[PDB]
Structure formats: structure tokens, C-alpha cells
Write a protein that holds these residues in place. Structure first.
Motif, PDB file in Angstrom:
ATOM      1  N   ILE A   1      -6.942   5.437   0.770  1.00 26.01           N
ATOM      2  CA  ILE A   1      -5.689   5.598   1.322  1.00 26.01           C
ATOM      3  C   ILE A   1      -4.400   5.095   1.647  1.00 26.01           C
ATOM      4  O   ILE A   1      -3.756   5.368   0.833  1.00 26.01           O
ATOM      5  CB  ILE A   1      -5.847   5.557   2.874  1.00 26.01           C
ATOM      6  N   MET A   2      -4.849   3.724   1.692  1.00 27.07           N
ATOM      7  CA  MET A   2      -3.771   2.839   1.310  1.00 27.07           C
ATOM      8  C   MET A   2      -2.768   2.941   0.691  1.00 27.07           C
ATOM      9  O   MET A   2      -1.535   2.972  -0.279  1.00 27.07           O
ATOM     10  CB  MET A   2      -4.005   1.299   1.581  1.00 27.07           C
ATOM     11  N   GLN A   3      -3.570   2.411  -1.165  1.00 30.45           N
ATOM     12  CA  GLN A   3      -2.915   2.890  -2.390  1.00 30.45           C
ATOM     13  C   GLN A   3      -2.396   4.331  -2.299  1.00 30.45           C
ATOM     14  O   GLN A   3      -1.339   4.442  -3.178  1.00 30.45           O
ATOM     15  CB  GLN A   3      -4.044   2.602  -3.082  1.00 30.45           C
ATOM     16  N   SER A   4      -3.358   5.191  -1.632  1.00 29.90           N
ATOM     17  CA  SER A   4      -2.383   6.430  -2.165  1.00 29.90           C
ATOM     18  C   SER A   4      -0.990   6.814  -1.619  1.00 29.90           C
ATOM     19  O   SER A   4      -0.275   7.534  -3.036  1.00 29.90           O
ATOM     20  CB  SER A   4      -3.243   6.901  -1.289  1.00 29.90           C
ATOM     21  N   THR A   5      -0.954   6.744  -0.484  1.00 33.34           N
ATOM     22  CA  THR A   5       0.889   7.015  -0.040  1.00 33.34           C
ATOM     23  C   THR A   5       0.889   5.962   0.572  1.00 33.34           C
ATOM     24  O   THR A   5       0.667   4.627   0.556  1.00 33.34           O
ATOM     25  CB  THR A   5       0.884   8.036   0.865  1.00 33.34           C
ATOM     26  N   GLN A   6       2.268   5.994  -0.308  1.00 33.90           N
ATOM     27  CA  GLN A   6       3.257   4.229   0.125  1.00 33.90           C
ATOM     28  C   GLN A   6       4.987   4.559   0.196  1.00 33.90           C
ATOM     29  O   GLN A   6       5.791   4.104  -0.291  1.00 33.90           O
ATOM     30  CB  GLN A   6       3.102   3.158  -1.120  1.00 33.90           C
ATOM     31  N   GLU A   7       4.760   5.709   1.106  1.00 33.96           N
ATOM     32  CA  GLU A   7       6.890   5.923   1.752  1.00 33.96           C
ATOM     33  C   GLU A   7       7.618   4.734   1.909  1.00 33.96           C
ATOM     34  O   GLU A   7       8.542   4.969   1.067  1.00 33.96           O
ATOM     35  CB  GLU A   7       6.478   7.183   2.812  1.00 33.96           C
ATOM     36  N   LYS A   8       7.742   4.535   3.212  1.00 35.24           N
ATOM     37  CA  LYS A   8       8.237   3.547   3.912  1.00 35.24           C
ATOM     38  C   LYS A   8       7.644   2.302   4.372  1.00 35.24           C
ATOM     39  O   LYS A   8       6.189   2.436   4.467  1.00 35.24           O
ATOM     40  CB  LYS A   8       9.387   3.665   4.545  1.00 35.24           C
ATOM     41  N   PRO A   9       8.090   1.614   4.950  1.00 35.30           N
ATOM     42  CA  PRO A   9       6.930   0.528   5.861  1.00 35.30           C
ATOM     43  C   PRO A   9       6.476   0.918   7.461  1.00 35.30           C
ATOM     44  O   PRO A   9       7.039   2.188   7.478  1.00 35.30           O
ATOM     45  CB  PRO A   9       7.990  -0.204   6.310  1.00 35.30           C
TER      46      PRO A   9
ATOM     47  N   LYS B   1      -2.706  -7.968  17.201  1.00 32.57           N
ATOM     48  CA  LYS B   1      -2.036  -7.716  15.891  1.00 32.57           C
ATOM     49  C   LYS B   1      -1.556  -7.186  15.091  1.00 32.57           C
ATOM     50  O   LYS B   1      -2.798  -6.699  13.948  1.00 32.57           O
ATOM     51  CB  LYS B   1      -2.023  -9.699  15.198  1.00 32.57           C
ATOM     52  N   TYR B   2      -0.645  -6.357  14.488  1.00 28.61           N
ATOM     53  CA  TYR B   2      -0.392  -5.687  13.549  1.00 28.61           C
ATOM     54  C   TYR B   2       0.523  -6.051  12.714  1.00 28.61           C
ATOM     55  O   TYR B   2       1.264  -7.429  12.475  1.00 28.61           O
ATOM     56  CB  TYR B   2       0.938  -4.074  14.309  1.00 28.61           C
ATOM     57  N   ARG B   3       1.147  -5.309  11.743  1.00 26.57           N
ATOM     58  CA  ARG B   3       1.194  -6.111  10.125  1.00 26.57           C
ATOM     59  C   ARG B   3       2.947  -4.445   9.687  1.00 26.57           C
ATOM     60  O   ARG B   3       1.912  -3.012   9.818  1.00 26.57           O
ATOM     61  CB  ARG B   3       0.121  -6.399   9.625  1.00 26.57           C
ATOM     62  N   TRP B   4       3.712  -5.099   9.068  1.00 25.70           N
ATOM     63  CA  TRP B   4       4.360  -4.024   7.402  1.00 25.70           C
ATOM     64  C   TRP B   4       3.663  -3.481   6.857  1.00 25.70           C
ATOM     65  O   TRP B   4       3.161  -4.738   6.046  1.00 25.70           O
ATOM     66  CB  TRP B   4       5.348  -4.764   7.910  1.00 25.70           C
ATOM     67  N   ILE B   5       3.253  -2.251   5.808  1.00 18.04           N
ATOM     68  CA  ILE B   5       2.295  -2.007   4.868  1.00 18.04           C
ATOM     69  C   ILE B   5       3.486  -0.752   4.345  1.00 18.04           C
ATOM     70  O   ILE B   5       3.767  -0.073   4.614  1.00 18.04           O
ATOM     71  CB  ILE B   5       0.900  -1.803   5.130  1.00 18.04           C
ATOM     72  N   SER B   6       3.264  -1.405   2.827  1.00 20.14           N
ATOM     73  CA  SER B   6       3.583   0.362   1.804  1.00 20.14           C
ATOM     74  C   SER B   6       3.829  -0.977   0.688  1.00 20.14           C
ATOM     75  O   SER B   6       4.593  -1.722   0.785  1.00 20.14           O
ATOM     76  CB  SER B   6       5.182   0.344   2.281  1.00 20.14           C
TER      77      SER B   6
END
Lengths: 405, 401
Positions: free
Chosen positions: A379-387, A400-405
């Protein structure tokens, strides 16, 4: 006499979905019953999503499109949910932090099952109309995650809709005071246990339909001349599933009638079916459902000239409201920029093995957990639109949260 | 163009209370540490009481005094709590039903720790100022129920506030509002029926907020001065000692004073508002409204006076705001007999109190025993009170007694 309503609105319908026709097959549903729901996909919240992530992801694109000056004028943040994280600490505290809003802001949460969204937005409209803070804006975010019963599962979604409310409302300018609200205590559906739902489907149906008629009656008593056919070019309703809405439109049209059968389907196709498009791809998003149908109407409908949209909200328990507003061709252009459809097209499709693993960790009172963004490596590797925001960990109940893309 | 604020307000500080002097005695507390709390009594919620019951009993004397046409103008019911009974179903559905409000009403619940009450009030005020329903009123009900130095302040209670176009009790200064929030883990209720928190961090944020909210107010109200603009001050009061220290910390930063200036100012502007909180305990989202009620009853309003109000809720959000109270407003308040209500509450013995009973969150079926403490069903009040009789398949059923 200041204008009020929606300047911008955006939908987050999950990072993952399920094909609900495949699900029916797997669960052996009666074909006619399942098909009568009128549903195709449901969003499915993953272990590292929560209502904060869902809300931040809906609002982020709104906030990114605003100037600094504009962003610092957000002075009301209201989170509408039935998926609370805390008995006291509201979702709005976390949403505010990760959106980087000004500290000069009221923050709180509003609760009334699926009516929460409307309650939020009405209160944000009265803030603007009150002119207690000239120039200010409000952000209302409806965020809910799901947690007779065989037939519910295909519509049980996860989603959030974020709505920016202000003095230049091109997307949806409300007709001020044009409101028929109505409520009373009924035990149709509730969430009395954490991470769990209960309810009586036949009762919810009757109360929804009773409120659909009374709310309009109340609106009419306030808005002389109000005509359920003539006044409104589209209609948006609280959409727990498409089939519910088609049923209620038929009921209403026969109650304010002298129409033919074919006139009813005609009216459904023109005024109602545009609003159901996104709802069919996300599921019942509870507090945010009507907003999702409204967004759907604005993206999918025809706005060559200004149109009046009639909106019906319902929540279990129960409270309800009918109100109206005007959408301009310019507002429709602004909504196009968010690319809601395009976003829904990019979600990751779950398999039945993936989905059955989740449909059976991050329980409501969790004190410590670390999460793994590889619990489904695709899933993570699948789509990477914006943060996008994700829940990374909870320690001492602090999320605690984190930004990913 | 339209006036706005409180038309009437009432407190329900419980059916039963515990003398906290005796509790400290019976529990062998350090008497300097206990005494600096400035607590005398706390309300104690019985098993057949819940936030609904607290809210209805606060609101019912207001509704009784209204005409039927006035009552029918209540078109917004906001319930403010952190003692929710459902993730979706608001407290307001049940309170609507037992007060007999018109169905042409919006109803919902608001949450942000001890700030919930102010948030709901401010949204009600904006309903009035919007004139989206000319002549409408709202009803805002804050209702909550709760290191053994915490026990003496853990109260239960509710305050109901009728908000309208003819506000003698507390007319707000429109737009005189300094709000301020940010995320901080000072206190939370992460498990049902539980609190967690960090004492120091809470004190700090509360003081940080008290300073920041006032600065914002002054940004919006030029010439506003902590000492002269306000004849009385009310604060979120988890307990008296922290309001005394807060008040002292603020004046220390902002006030020109002689040696007993801070004491004099505390006695004059803050102490009135502490009177009821010291008899009820920390009631969370309703604490500030209780301090305001206390101020109006115990203060001197031979002429209109301005009251400044400071609201804090953990997590956190906060606001400083203000409004005017008239002599006529005090008189109308006096008709509710709040102090008398507090004076008629059932005093528990130490052993009666020790029965530690309760209906847990998420109970599905229970039937309550009104004879659990028999003396209490003995002993009249002046009015029928609402109590919880049973939960049936999650549906709560209440009864007047």
C-alpha cells in the motif's frame, strides 16, 4: 448583511478500498438485496489511520491552496465525529497542530451521530454571520471510521470531508434562516460500546423518513413559496447507502406530488443521482455523509448558471435538518481543482485475504503501541500522490503522527 | 444590532455531598496541603444519577419559570460534557425529551475538556447574533461527573444556561473574545470512567492560557486593563487554591499594587465566584459557569457591572471573555435559590460515602436500587428530581421522584 457558507471543501475517502460486489459473493448475499443497496466500493481505514489522519488528509489540500494571510484567518476549528479518541480531548487539538493553524483559534468537537457534520457547519455559518470576528473563517471537518448486520457490512465506510466556511462562499452560499430542523429521542442506532455499533434498521428507516418530511415542512413554514420540485435544482441527502436515498426521494415526491412514476425516476436522475456518485465509492461515512453527497453533486452536476441545492441531514438518536444554498459556476471550477474523483481512483484495492485480516489492535483506549507501515507492504509503496499523515505511535496516550510520500 | 447573552442560569450541585474537612480529617492528610486547596464540600453522584439527570435537574427550574411561549422558542440545545454516554448519541436527545422541549430544535453535544461549556455558550451567542431565527433562544447545559489530594475536589454537577435576546443576567460584549489553543497532553480521559494527567504541565498551560487569552482580548478591545475594566473575575475553577494562585500570578505580571493589593483584589473580585465551587468541587466543563453563577449571586450589583471570564480546558483550548450583569439580572438569579439548593443537599456519613454501586460506561442492562442509601429517598426537595431507573438494551430510562 454578510454572505456565508462554503469557500472550499475536500474529501478524503481512504487510502484503501474494498470492492463490495466481490464481498457480496464471498459472503453469499441475496443478490437482489445487495443490488438494492446500490453500493460499489467502501473505503477501509488501516491500523495506521485514525480520524485525525482522515481529517488532516481531507483539509490539507484546502489549507495548501490558501495564502498565509487566509490561513491565519481560520479562527474556528470544529471536528464532527462519532469516532472520538478521548472522552475529553477532542480530535481538533491534533488536527490543529498538524495543519499548522494559528493558536488564536477555538477548537472543539461536536457529536450527534450522523448530524454532527451539519451541526458543525451551521455553527460555523453563525460565527460568520455574527461578525464577531470580521474577515475570519472556520474550518469544519467531519471524520468517521466504521468499526441486517450482513447487509450493513458492504456500506460500512471510512471517510472525512473538510469544509472551509467564510465570507466569500462560491462553492455553497447558504440561504440564511432557510432551515427546518427537527429532533426527538429515538433508539434507532448508537455506539454505546467503544469500537462497536448497535441499532434497529427498520426503526432508523422510519425515523429518517419521518424526519425527511418534517424537516421540509419546517423549512416551508419559514420559507413561504418553498416548492420541493421547483426551488431546488439538485438535492443532497444523508447517504448511508444509495438505495436508502432513492427510497426517500420517491416517498417525498409522492407526498409533494401530482407526478407520474416516470416523472419520479426522471427527477431522481436529474436532481439526485449526481450526489450519489462518491457515496457509492466510499460507503456510509456517518457524520460526513451528507457533505460527501453535496461534494458529489457539485463535481458531477451541471452548473452553467447558479443553482439552488436542497440538503437533508439525519443522524440517529435523533436530530435532523433541511437547508438550502446556491452554488455558482465559479465554485464548481474551484472544487475541480481538488480532483476528488482522481483521488478516489488512486486508492489501493484490498483482497479478501487482506480485508479479512483487518475485519478481525489500535483499540480505543490504547496507551502504548508502535505501528508498522509494512503490515501490508504493497500500500505505502503503491500510491505516493502528496504528503499524507499517518499514525506512527501512541505513547502515554499521546498520539504521534508522521508525514509520508 | 441585537443584544445577546444569559437570560437565566441555574446550578445543580448534586443530590448528596461530602464534608471535605471531615474527609481530610478521616484520611489523615497534611493539613497545610489540604487547606491550600480551599475546598469545603464536594457533590457526590449517586449510582442512579448520570449527566442526563444532572443536566435536567439544572435546567428544569429555568424551564418551569418560563412561559410556554418562551419555552417553545428554545430552538438550540447544546449539552457540554466529557462524561459522554455514547460515541454517537448526544446527551441532548434525552434531556430534550425529559424537559419536553419543542421538536423544532437542533440538538447536539460538544467536547473540549473544561472548555466545552464556553464553546457551547459562544456558539449559542452566535446563533442569537446571527438572527437566523429572530426571537429564538438556546439552552446550553454543561454537566460532568468525576494524589489523594485530588479526592476532595472531585465533584459532580451541571449548570444550565438559557441564552437569548434579553440578557439581564449576563449580556456579552460582542467580539470581546480572546481565544487561544494548541495541542498539549496535560490531562485526558482516554479510558472510559478514567482520567490521566500531568499535574505540573496542566498548571503551566492553564497559566500560559490565562496570560495569552487576556492579551488577545486586549488586542481586540483597546484600552482593556486587567484591573479597571472588570469589577469581578470568574475562572475555570478545578479548585479554589489554583484560582487564588492564578489570580496572584496575573496581577504579579500586570498589576500596580501596594503590599495587600493582591489580597484586597482577590477578596473583592474573585472570592464571590469561589463560594459555590468550594461547596461542589471540580465540575469540569461547568466549573467556569458555576463560578459565574456564584459571582452574580454573591457579588454586589446595585449598578451594572462588567465580569471578565477565563475559560481553560485541557488538551487544550481556552478563552477570555466578558459581559455585563444588571441588578435586575441578580434578582432574577436570586429567584432560583441556588445556595438554598446547595444547603438542602443530603450529607453523607463517611461510611455511606465509602460504598464505592457505579454504572460503568457501556452497560447494556441494569436496574437501579433507589434504596441503596435509604436516608436519601427520605428528605424532600422543593421540586421533582430526575433519576436513572434502568438501562434496557442500552436505552436509558428515567423517573421523577
Amino acid at each position: 448583511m454578510v454572505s456565508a457558507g462554503i469557500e472550499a471543501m475536500n474529501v478524503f475517502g481512504g487510502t484503501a478500498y474494498l470492492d463490495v460486489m466481490e464481498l457480496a459473493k464471498y459472503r453469499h448475499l441475496d443478490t437482489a438485496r445487495f443490488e438494492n443497496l446500490l453500493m460499489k466500493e467502501k473505503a477501509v481505514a488501516l491500523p495506521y489511520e485514525d480520524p485525525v489522519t482522515f481529517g488532516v488528509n481531507a483539509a490539507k489540500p484546502i489549507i495548501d491552496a490558501l495564502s498565509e494571510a487566509e490561513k491565519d484567518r481560520i479562527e474556528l476549528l470544529i471536528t464532527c465525529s462519532a469516532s472520538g479518541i478521548d472522552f475529553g480531548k477532542s480530535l481538533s487539538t491534533y488536527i490543529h497542530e498538524y495543519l499548522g493553524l494559528n493558536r488564536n483559534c477555538r477548537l472543539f468537537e461536536v457529536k450527534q451521530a450522523c448530524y454532527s457534520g451539519t451541526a458543525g457547519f451551521q455553527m460555523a455559518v453563525n460565527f460568520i454571520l455574527s461578525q464577531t470576528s470580521p474577515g475570519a473563517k472556520a474550518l469544519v471537518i467531519a471524520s468517521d471510521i466504521s468499526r441486517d448486520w450482513s447487509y450493513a457490512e458492504p456500506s460500512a465506510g471510512a471517510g472525512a470531508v473538510a469544509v472551509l466556511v467564510g465570507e466569500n462562499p462560491e462553492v455553497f452560499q447558504i440561504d440564511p434562516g432557510a432551515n427546518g430542523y427537527y429532533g426527538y429521542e429515538v433508539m434507532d442506532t448508537c455506539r454505546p460500546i467503544p469500537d462497536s455499533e448497535a441499532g434497529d434498521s427498520d426503526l432508523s428507516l422510519m425515523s429518517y423518513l419521518d424526519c425527511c418530511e418534517q424537516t421540509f415542512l419546517e423549512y416551508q413554514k419559514r420559507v413561504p413559496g418553498a416548492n420541493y420540485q421547483d426551488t431546488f435544482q439538485y438535492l443532497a441527502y444523508h447517504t448511508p447507502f444509495g438505495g436508502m436515498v432513492k427510497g426517500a426521494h420517491r416517498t417525498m415526491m409522492r407526498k409533494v406530488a401530482k407526478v407520474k412514476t416516470s416523472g419520479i425516476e426522471t427527477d431522481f436522475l436529474t436532481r439526485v443521482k449526481p450526489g450519489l456518485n462518491y457515496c457509492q465509492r466510499v460507503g456510509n461515512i456517518m457524520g460526513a455523509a451528507l457533505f460527501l453527497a453535496l461534494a458529489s453533486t457539485i463535481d458531477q452536476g451541471r452548473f452553467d448558471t447558479p443553482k439552488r441545492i436542497g440538503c437533508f441531514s439525519y443522524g440517529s438518536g435523533c436530530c435532523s435538518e433541511f437547508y438550502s444554498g446556491i452554488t455558482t459556476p465559479q465554485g464548481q471550477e474551484r472544487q475541480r481543482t481538488f480532483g476528488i474523483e482522481k483521488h478516489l481512483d488512486r486508492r489501493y484495492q484490498l483482497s479478501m485475504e487482506e480485508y479479512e485480516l483487518l475485519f478481525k489492535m489500535v483499540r480505543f483506549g490504547t496507551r502504548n503501541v508502535k505501528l508498522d507501515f509494512e503490515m501490508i507492504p504493497g500500500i505505502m509503496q503503491s500510491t505516493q500522490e502528496k504528503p499524507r499523515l499517518f499514525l506512527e505511535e501512541i505513547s502515554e496516550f499521546h498520539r504521534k503522527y508522521r508525514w509520508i510520500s
